[PDB]
Amino acid sequence: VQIFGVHSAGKNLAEDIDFGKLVFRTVGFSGADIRNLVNEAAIMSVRKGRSYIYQQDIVDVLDKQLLEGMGVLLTEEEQQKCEQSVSYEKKRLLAV
Amino acid sequence: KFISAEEKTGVTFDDFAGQEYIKRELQEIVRILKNDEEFQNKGIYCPKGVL
Numbered sequence: 001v002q003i004f005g006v007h008s009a010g011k012n013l014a015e016d017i018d019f020g021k022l023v024f025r026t027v028g029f030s031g032a033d034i035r036n037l038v039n040e041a042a043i044m045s046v047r048k049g050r051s052y053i054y055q056q057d058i059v060d061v062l063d064k065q066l067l068e069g070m071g072v073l074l075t076e077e078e079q080q081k082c083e084q085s086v087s088y089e090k091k092r093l094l095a096v
Numbered sequence: 097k098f099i100s101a102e103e104k105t106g107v108t109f110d111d112f113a114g115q116e117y118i119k120r121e122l123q124e125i126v127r128i129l130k131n132d133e134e135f136q137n138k139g140i141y142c143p144k145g146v147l
Contacts, residue, residue, distance in 0.1 A: 011139050042140050043124065073117045 003031050008038040014052035021055075025062050037061060122146070 004019040026034065040061045045053045074082070109119060128135050128142045 039139075039141060042138055043128075046135065046138065046140065047124070073115075075117055075120075 003034050004038065007031065007035040008041075011038065011042055012052045014054050016055045017053060017058075018055065019058075022058060022062070040065075 001019050001023065008019075026037070029037075037058065041053045041058045044061050044064075045051075045057045050057065109123075112119065125142055125146060128140060132142070
């Protein structure tokens, strides 16, 4: 938390920013990892045109970093079309 | 005296397709490098090496 505060001082964090609720997502991180997380949060906040960094910005940055791990690099349209490709009977089994 | 300091190759982004996520991610880095002042105002720094 202190490293995140040090490396995210000179950026316009919004009122919903709190790193105390995202500590468990950064277990094993070093200072460079948290700095890269802050930088990617700034990039993604710029990406949607958002002026500040939201908590959803950091959440989506961590989620993108996690989804990139297993070899899934898909945009929103491809993901939605692929979700619509499967049927409904074989989706309720996964849901259950 | 062999390295080509080529300014134009004739191959654009429209020629390479199918990996639009990687294309957009490289577009972000290229735009950051070209527009370093505007994005550096908010503290964004580009990576030195992309592999």
